Amino acid sequence: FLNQITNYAKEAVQSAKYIGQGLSVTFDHMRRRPITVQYPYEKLIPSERFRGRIHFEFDKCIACEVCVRVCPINLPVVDWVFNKELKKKELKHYSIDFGVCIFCANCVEYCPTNCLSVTEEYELATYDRHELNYDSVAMGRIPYKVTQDPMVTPIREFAYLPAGVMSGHDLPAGAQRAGERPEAIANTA
Amino acid sequence: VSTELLVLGVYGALAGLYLLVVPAIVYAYLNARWYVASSFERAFMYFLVTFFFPGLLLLAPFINFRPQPRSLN
Amino acid sequence: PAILNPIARPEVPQELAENIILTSLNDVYDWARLSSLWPLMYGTACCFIEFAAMIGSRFDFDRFGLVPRNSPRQADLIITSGTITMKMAPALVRLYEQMPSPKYVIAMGACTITGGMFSSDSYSAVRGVDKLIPVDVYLPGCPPRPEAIMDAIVKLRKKIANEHINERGNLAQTHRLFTAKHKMKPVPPILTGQYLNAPSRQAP
Amino acid sequence: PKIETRTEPMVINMGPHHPSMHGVLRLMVTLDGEDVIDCEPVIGYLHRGMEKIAENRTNIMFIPYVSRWDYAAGMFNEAVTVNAPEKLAGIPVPKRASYIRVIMLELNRIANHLLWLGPFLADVGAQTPFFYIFREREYIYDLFEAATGMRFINNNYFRIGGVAADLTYGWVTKCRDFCDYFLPKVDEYERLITNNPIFVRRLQGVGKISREEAINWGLSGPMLRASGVKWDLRKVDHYECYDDFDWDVPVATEGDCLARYIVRIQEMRESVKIIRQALDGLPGGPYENLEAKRMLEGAKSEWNGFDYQYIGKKLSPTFKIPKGEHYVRVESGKGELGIYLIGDDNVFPWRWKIRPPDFNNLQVLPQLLKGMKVADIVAILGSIDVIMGSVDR
Amino acid sequence: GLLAGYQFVKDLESAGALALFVPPEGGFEGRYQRRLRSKGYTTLPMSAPGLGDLAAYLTQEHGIRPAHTGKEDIRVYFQPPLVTYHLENLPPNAKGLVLWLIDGKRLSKQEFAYLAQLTQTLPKFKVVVEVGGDRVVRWEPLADW
Amino acid sequence: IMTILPGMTVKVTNPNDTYYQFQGIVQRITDGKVAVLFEGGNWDKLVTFQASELEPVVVT
Amino acid sequence: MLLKSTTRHVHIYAGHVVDGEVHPDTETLTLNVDPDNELEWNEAALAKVEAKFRELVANAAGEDLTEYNLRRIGSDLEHFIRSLLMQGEIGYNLNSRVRNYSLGIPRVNHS
Amino acid sequence: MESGIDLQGQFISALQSLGLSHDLAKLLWLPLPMLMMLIVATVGVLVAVWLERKISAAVQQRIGPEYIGPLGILAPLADGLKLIFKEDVLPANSDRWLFTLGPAVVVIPVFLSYIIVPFGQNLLISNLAMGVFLWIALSSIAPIGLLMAGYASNNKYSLLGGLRAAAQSISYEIPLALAVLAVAMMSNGLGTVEIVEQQSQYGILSWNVWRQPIGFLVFWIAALAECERLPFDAEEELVAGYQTEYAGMKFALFYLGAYVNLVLSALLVSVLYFGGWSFPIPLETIANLLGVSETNPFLQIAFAVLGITMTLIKAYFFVFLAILLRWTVPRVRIDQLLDLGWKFLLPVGLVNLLLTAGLKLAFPVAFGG
Numbered sequence A: 001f002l003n004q005i006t007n008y009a010k011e012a013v014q015s016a017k018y019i020g021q022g023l024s025v026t027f028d029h030m031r032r033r034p035i036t037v038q039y040p041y042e043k044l045i046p047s048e049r050f051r052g053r054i055h056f057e058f059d060k061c062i063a064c065e066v067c068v069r070v071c072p073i074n075l076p077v078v079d080w081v082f083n084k085e086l087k088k089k090e091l092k093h094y095s096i097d098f099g100v101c102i103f104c105a106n107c108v109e110y111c112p113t114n115c116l117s118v119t120e121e122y123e124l125a126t127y128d129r130h131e132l133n134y135d136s137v138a139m140g141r142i143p144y145k146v147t148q149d150p151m152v153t154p155i156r157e158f159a160y161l162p163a164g165v166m167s168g169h170d171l172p173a174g175a176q177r178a179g180e181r182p183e184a185i186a187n188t189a
Numbered sequence B: 001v002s003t004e005l006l007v008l009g010v011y012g013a014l015a016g017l018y019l020l021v022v023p024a025i026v027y028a029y030l031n032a033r034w035y036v037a038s039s040f041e042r043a044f045m046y047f048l049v050t051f052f053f054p055g056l057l058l059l060a061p062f063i064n065f066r067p068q069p070r071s072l073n
Numbered sequence C: 001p002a003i004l005n006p007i008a009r010p011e012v013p014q015e016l017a018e019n020i021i022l023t024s025l026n027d028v029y030d031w032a033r034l035s036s037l038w039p040l041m042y043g044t045a046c047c048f049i050e051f052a053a054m055i056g057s058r059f060d061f062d063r064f065g066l067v068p069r070n071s072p073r074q075a076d077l078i079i080t081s082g083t084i085t086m087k088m089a090p091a092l093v094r095l096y097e098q099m100p101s102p103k104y105v106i107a108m109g110a111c112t113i114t115g116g117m118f119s120s121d122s123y124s125a126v127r128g129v130d131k132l133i134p135v136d137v138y139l140p141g142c143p144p145r146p147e148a149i150m151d152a153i154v155k156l157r158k159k160i161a162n163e164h165i166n167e168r169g170n171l172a173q174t175h176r177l178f179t180a181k182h183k184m185k186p187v188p189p190i191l192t193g194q195y196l197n198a199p200s201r202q203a204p
Numbered sequence D: 001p002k003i004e005t006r007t008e009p010m011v012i013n014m015g016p017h018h019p020s021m022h023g024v025l026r027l028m029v030t031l032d033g034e035d036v037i038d039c040e041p042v043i044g045y046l047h048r049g050m051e052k053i054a055e056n057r058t059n060i061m062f063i064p065y066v067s068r069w070d071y072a073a074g075m076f077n078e079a080v081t082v083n084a085p086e087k088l089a090g091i092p093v094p095k096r097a098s099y100i101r102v103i104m105l106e107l108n109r110i111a112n113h114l115l116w117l118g119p120f121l122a123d124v125g126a127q128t129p130f131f132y133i134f135r136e137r138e139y140i141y142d143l144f145e146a147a148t149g150m151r152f153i154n155n156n157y158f159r160i161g162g163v164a165a166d167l168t169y170g171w172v173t174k175c176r177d178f179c180d181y182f183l184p185k186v187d188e189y190e191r192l193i194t195n196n197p198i199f200v201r202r203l204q205g206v207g208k209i210s211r212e213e214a215i216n217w218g219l220s221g222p223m224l225r226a227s228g229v230k231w232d233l234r235k236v237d238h239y240e241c242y243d244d245f246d247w248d249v250p251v252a253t254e255g256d257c258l259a260r261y262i263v264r265i266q267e268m269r270e271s272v273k274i275i276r277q278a279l280d281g282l283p284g285g286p287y288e289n290l291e292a293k294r295m296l297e298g299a300k301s302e303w304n305g306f307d308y309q310y311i312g313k314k315l316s317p318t319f320k321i322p323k324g325e326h327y328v329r330v331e332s333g334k335g336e337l338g339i340y341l342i343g344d345d346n347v348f349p350w351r352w353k354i355r356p357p358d359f360n361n362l363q364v365l366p367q368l369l370k371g372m373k374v375a376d377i378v379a380i381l382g383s384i385d386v387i388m389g390s391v392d393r
Numbered sequence E: 001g002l003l004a005g006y007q008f009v010k011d012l013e014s015a016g017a018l019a020l021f022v023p024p025e026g027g028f029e030g031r032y033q034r035r036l037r038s039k040g041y042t043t044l045p046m047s048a049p050g051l052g053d054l055a056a057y058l059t060q061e062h063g064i065r066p067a068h069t070g071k072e073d074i075r076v077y078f079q080p081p082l083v084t085y086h087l088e089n090l091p092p093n094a095k096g097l098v099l100w101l102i103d104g105k106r107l108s109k110q111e112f113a114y115l116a117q118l119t120q121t122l123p124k125f126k127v128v129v130e131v132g133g134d135r136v137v138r139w140e141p142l143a144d145w
Numbered sequence F: 001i002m003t004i005l006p007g008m009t010v011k012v013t014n015p016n017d018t019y020y021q022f023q024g025i026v027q028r029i030t031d032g033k034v035a036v037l038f039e040g041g042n043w044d045k046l047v048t049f050q051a052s053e054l055e056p057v058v059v060t
Numbered sequence G: 001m002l003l004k005s006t007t008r009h010v011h012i013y014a015g016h017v018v019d020g021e022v023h024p025d026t027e028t029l030t031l032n033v034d035p036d037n038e039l040e041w042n043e044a045a046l047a048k049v050e051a052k053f054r055e056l057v058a059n060a061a062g063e064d065l066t067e068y069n070l071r072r073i074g075s076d077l078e079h080f081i082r083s084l085l086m087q088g089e090i091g092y093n094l095n096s097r098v099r100n101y102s103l104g105i106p107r108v109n110h111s
Numbered sequence H: 001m002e003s004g005i006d007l008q009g010q011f012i013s014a015l016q017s018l019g020l021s022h023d024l025a026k027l028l029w030l031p032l033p034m035l036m037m038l039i040v041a042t043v044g045v046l047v048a049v050w051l052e053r054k055i056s057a058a059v060q061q062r063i064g065p066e067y068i069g070p071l072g073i074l075a076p077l078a079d080g081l082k083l084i085f086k087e088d089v090l091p092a093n094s095d096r097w098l099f100t101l102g103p104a105v106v107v108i109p110v111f112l113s114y115i116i117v118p119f120g121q122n123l124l125i126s127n128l129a130m131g132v133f134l135w136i137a138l139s140s141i142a143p144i145g146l147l148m149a150g151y152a153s154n155n156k157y158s159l160l161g162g163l164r165a166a167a168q169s170i171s172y173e174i175p176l177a178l179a180v181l182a183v184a185m186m187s188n189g190l191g192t193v194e195i196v197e198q199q200s201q202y203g204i205l206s207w208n209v210w211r212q213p214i215g216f217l218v219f220w221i222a223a224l225a226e227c228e229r230l231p232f233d234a235e236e237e238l239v240a241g242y243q244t245e246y247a248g249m250k251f252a253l254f255y256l257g258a259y260v261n262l263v264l265s266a267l268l269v270s271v272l273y274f275g276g277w278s279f280p281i282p283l284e285t286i287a288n289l290l291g292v293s294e295t296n297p298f299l300q301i302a303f304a305v306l307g308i309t310m311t312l313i314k315a316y317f318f319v320f321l322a323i324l325l326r327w328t329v330p331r332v333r334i335d336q337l338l339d340l341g342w343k344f345l346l347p348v349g350l351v352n353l354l355l356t357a358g359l360k361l362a363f364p365v366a367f368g369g
């Protein structure tokens, strides 16, 4: 009764053919171009909505507290003294602690004067934690532009690659996002 | 010229090739075709790293395989 | 006192390494611990998934030198990738204490810098991992994208390349060891491991 | 070396430091020779107190909090947190906002099943496509980053009036490109397990929850569907215009890890069909075409209508959760993520209970580890799709 | 591989304020900070974008106003001037203090000029602002910019 | 005094960029790099450009 | 099962240390003021912290030997250590490797 | 050398030219091939770590350990050097003698087994008439350092991991011995010079892989379970793996011993079942086609370099096959790998030994003499 000996050798040779096939198809993975976004020299561009570091304009601020009452932890320290010579609110030393911030930009949407805008800046690492307390002149700085650094080849991620492209590595020369924009169908139809 | 000295000369030439010359050629081949290489060519250049590895280790703190600064224009 | 939380004057400590051989060996030492930097595979919350997004193929974890380790004994670095609760905090201090002495901590996300969105109305969240561990680099962003984490790793490498080899001795613990006798009642172990074999699952 | 060798059953810790993507839970199992006799799961290492935080947060400032329970499909949490004051105040959503919600939730279901699928194949022993699953998950990340601003969790996308912002100018095209890319990948993932006898030997009869025992233990989602129950809350509750498409709930009859695998793979294959059928029937189509049609055709002609908007009356931050209570739910990637809201005409809720989809599936884990071996623990824990931020919350 | 001597400390003592150009991949300039610290200096490595209005943060008292998370009041904290508090709380026979700014990018030209003039005016204070970029570690004086 | 002032409307003309045909509001001018504010979307974005890739509009 | 309360600047460790091992004892508990040296710890303030710790462990008599009470003792000792640092009797280290000011930045007294 | 090239004879003769003894000249010659072989094993472990981190990256469509040297070339060296700099840990009641000796006992015979490997005819440390049998006997000392590293930690899950690794490491000694036994049948000896010399007759047709098609498979699968690799090794088996208490240079000893065992096993696949140094064309055929003698020193140098390249090509090919097969195969648990060791590789090794004995008795001109 050799029905379990030939089945044994059949299971062995089927596993051997499976290992040979999987070894042939893992050898076809080495020929593919690596999808690695090589960070310090290939900083990938964030999208047009990113919610990075919050930017603040000290002159466009009516010194309300809507940016505090919509923040989930009431984080922005806005303090004002009322000047009865002018009878306005007169902000002094706005600040946001970016070690406590969760970067939801609730304060950006519910800003009545469009004072708080959000940036593309995410490289905010510090050695001291208390350096993350950005005051009104610290967070009123112009953010780091990824496409204007002469050591970075910037990469559009997936939603800005035109209409058939999956990875932004083979891009020849700055091809746009997907196609037409609402200033085209107004000319079309 | 003595033939013992010529055998030592081809020993020194083979050592200078194995440690300095062809490791520099392998480095100049690897900042060259690495992505245009196939799987078999990748196995061949990995063999070239394997065989000339003491020469690649000697030449390692002197090559600067960082990307060049961009033009921004 | 006129300075509330003061710094203190040191004892004029200087190595004064006028030697250039030992300076280059210090360079080799700092480059070797800099370019290896094996982190602990430590998770606990949301941020770990972005940490896992570094270990994948789109952003590469290995191309700075660092492969994740399972045991803390082989771990060179710990990226605290999530919220530390009151329950997780002694476990985290234990797995930091189980590492060899040239060890580095990165407070990843707002939950380990200050306990970011749980710094207001939480009763069981440690407000910052630096209430437990000496932290080297702080990393903002609630889910900091993996470019920000391997920016924190770049700043950690800038921190590591400064470390002097004669300055080993800051890696100490400096015991104080005040022992006091107490009069508290010992309680039995409440959590033993008996879940289905406990004689209350079978019948009401 | 004070480890003796007894004849009594030992105890394996499997503590909160998991060296893989397993969360923070202890799994103190006994396992005398190999048979797991007892299993006490210790829970609460990520209990940060969302139910007590919620009582001191307005709903417009609790939306950044609700991504942190199921933090692989984050917007599903917003899909109940928005829907809880939506059905007290009776605020209607537009049709375009509802279809955008369906698209975001089905992309989140695909991403949640991908993040389950990576560690599950790594625990079962495949461990080759772990690095290939994060690539399509990064595709979903970059889709979410265009619209919602952030990646997989920290979206403020869902609002009481619908959706915070409409889609970008190239979003529908790239989402169709991702679906055309992703349709063969789920077939590859199914053939990885089912066309390999060692894996189906590892997954057959491992965890033998019954049909009625799954209903008694309160299991939901793919753990309930794999036991035999055709119970999807998108079909049971006529929820958020999911009935405008033609998809079939995937079920299996066994209830083991292979059945849960098959249900989750077919859930991916059905969710991508829902994505296609929602992108086709998007009111106004893509945002570039809809914005152009409401630009050139005056300020009229039904493209400025209510059901073609992204937001249904964008509300003030001082919106009062009115007096009354009910219990909303979604079918997330693990099914029955529910919110019990008892708001009492205050700006804050009075009680915000979170019914998590996998806190009630992790209580079956001692029952599922009864007659199993040691190396089948992490498979069974792999098949639950547990995420400890929802289990603890 | 580039056995660097102690020329960096000599260029620091010459210029007073030098802009570093570090490769962006990590720690290849901290060898110069360790060379600088071995000659008797005290380096103060801190991140530049966290500082705001360097005339006020470095040498003036500045109210920090930390984060109240909806619980405390405004509670202004008056931090001492960083350069003068770290210079007075120093050994009197030390070589001086060095501000090691690790993000010279995302700062203005006015702050660079102020940092150079600040290193010129008070005697023992040097800055090594890291404006980054270059393929090797190379430094210039903070003269033109 | 004639150069690019903060407070007006702009539109980008750099063709090989993610931000193309985008109208924005210029907010701050330091050292030539112009940072403009984009109202498009629920969150207001601030993206930095230079004067070599910007030009003001005449229509609005 | 070793009962302990390990945070920064205090370690409680209910038990006694032998060589480099702490053995879990019932009726004693140790104390490891600043095991990472963020503070300077002259002997006057060190004796003050030791006396405050013995007063705290005497006032905690009669309760359970849970980790909750050990964490309460360690947290009260943490508040005392921060009060000594705020009074000016204790300085920051400045020879450490981190220098992150885990108990507040330096600041002047009034303004 | 003039008549040939013999660096041993030339070194002993030129060291006797200073005024030393003959036995003292031999004693001073003695550390030089041993130091050369330790250099070969050290560059082999660095090549193995580099190839492991680069081919694994190329499989997963990543880029390997960049920014450490030009390519990732200095990536293993830093991974060596950092482990020299890290402190000790000593897990809480550890034995402090067996703990430090466990890595030493598990990596000393693997280094000692590098006498057996030739890179050419008399390009080795010693011929050693019981060569591969001594390699198998020395490789049998590994599940004593494994049990030593398991026991000397005061925690469990490493004692369990140590017993698990020792039960894995003895399940594949006997199929390894049977697969080497078939080659020792076909080679009429155990010395590796004689094993390669019975294959370097017709270049590539006299290689043992064509005459042992299943013996090569048994040896390769059994040697991939002795090196702790592939399926026979992402949550750990239980929580820990017999080396979760080793931190600095002792974990470095474990880490380098694994790859040194991998390089040695690949070299012995190249030596036993393939040509150890033989070109696929026989070398004396090229020597008679060139017309120059096979004893003049430049053809000696060219043939020695060609033999070293052939050895390193085949050793690299099997290291490459191991790094591919680490990501090819599914990871099997402990019971399936012990069933592969006892219930599959041992009966196939026994039936291979029986059929190669029948083939040597029946056709003795094809299988040895």
Ligand code: SF4
Pocket (backbone or CB within 6 Å): A060, A061, A062, A063, A064, A065, A066, A067, A068, A078, A110, A111, A112, A113, A114, A115, A116
């Ligand atoms: S909401 Fe805007 S305007 Fe009001 S205080 Fe905040 S930043 Fe200023």
Ligand code: SF4
Pocket (backbone or CB within 6 Å): A054, A067, A070, A071, A072, A073, A074, A075, A076, A096, A100, A101, A102, A103, A104, A105, A106, A107, A108
């Ligand atoms: S982004 Fe969110 S967390 Fe940060 S300050 Fe604004 S509202 Fe608060």
Ligand code: SF4
Pocket (backbone or CB within 6 Å): C045, C046, C047, C081, C082, C083, C108, C109, C110, C111, C112, C116, C141, C142, C143, D068, D153
């Ligand atoms: S910082 Fe945000 S993403 Fe990170 S753990 Fe905390 S809540 Fe989760």
